[PDB]
Subunit: 153 residues, 2 copies
């Protein structure tokens, strides 16, 4: 069998590439990667066509994650092929709740990734205008949430 | 001004990610990578959410290629935004020509990547059912074809 999770942010160059990479690493360490199809996408068209933010790549290198992405925009079909859509902030939740109420098939559950954080830090905030530490913060949030999310399966 | 190309195969884990990263390298070598939007996608949905075949991931690693991809399916809007859709085999071509006539706005020129081969190896066979040498052959094909394609424009 297979479960499916799509991590969504605004641009798909900082947060969601990291969440994707952290969840893939986490299901590889647990030896469950055979049963997970994992992707990430953007709500907007700003950064489609681009690689991850280098601060994110270097943050992922720091934890031995082989991040591997080209930014893409979320589609209509993603709401049908993915069991969970996990986003970063209320703004993503707002936009995705709109498009979910305007689609021919909506299998996905649309939730905040931060809603799984044991520490209850609800928002994973865009680190694009921060420094390398803002990216490490996001990686810690993603790891905490991704572990809870996995636990509850 | 800015140009763009989409590399398409069946699942987007074997040939097309290689072609994608090969082309991305040799536009960077030519110092024209600012003027290119580069990506790859699948005709089907089976492999969506997977990283590239680890064999190909090894092939790229052996030629110093930074492959960074998760599989995605081609979309309506890919046909509208991409200047080129270069595919691998007649099945891709067949399926892409049909979808191209089924969208309201098709910018993309759909060709076989192999049609650019100076050696005239027109089909880039799927290496999925073979070994590491089958990925080396696809690489060398993508290398020939991408060069000749960039030299066209």
């Amino acid at each position: 069998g297979s479960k499916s999770v799509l991590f969504v942010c605004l641009g798909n160059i900082c947060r969601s590439p990291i969440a994707e990479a952290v969840f893939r690493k986490l299901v590889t360490d647990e030896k469950v990667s055979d049963n997970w199809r994992i992707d990430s996408a953007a709500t907007s068209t700003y950064e489609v066509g681009n690689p991850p933010d280098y601060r994110g790549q270097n943050c992922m290198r720091k934890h031995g994650i082989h991040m591997q992405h080209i930014a893409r925009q979320i589609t209509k079909e993603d709401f049908a092929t993915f069991d969970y859509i996990l986003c970063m902030d209320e703004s993503n939740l707002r936009d995705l709740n709109r498009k979910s109420n305007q689609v021919k098939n909506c299998k996905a559950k649309i939730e905040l990734l931060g809603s799984y954080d044991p520490q209850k830090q609800l928002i994973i905030e865009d680190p694009y205008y921060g420094n390398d530490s803002d990216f490490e913060v996001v990686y810690q949030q993603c790891l905490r949430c991704c572990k809870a999310f996995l636990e509850k399966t």
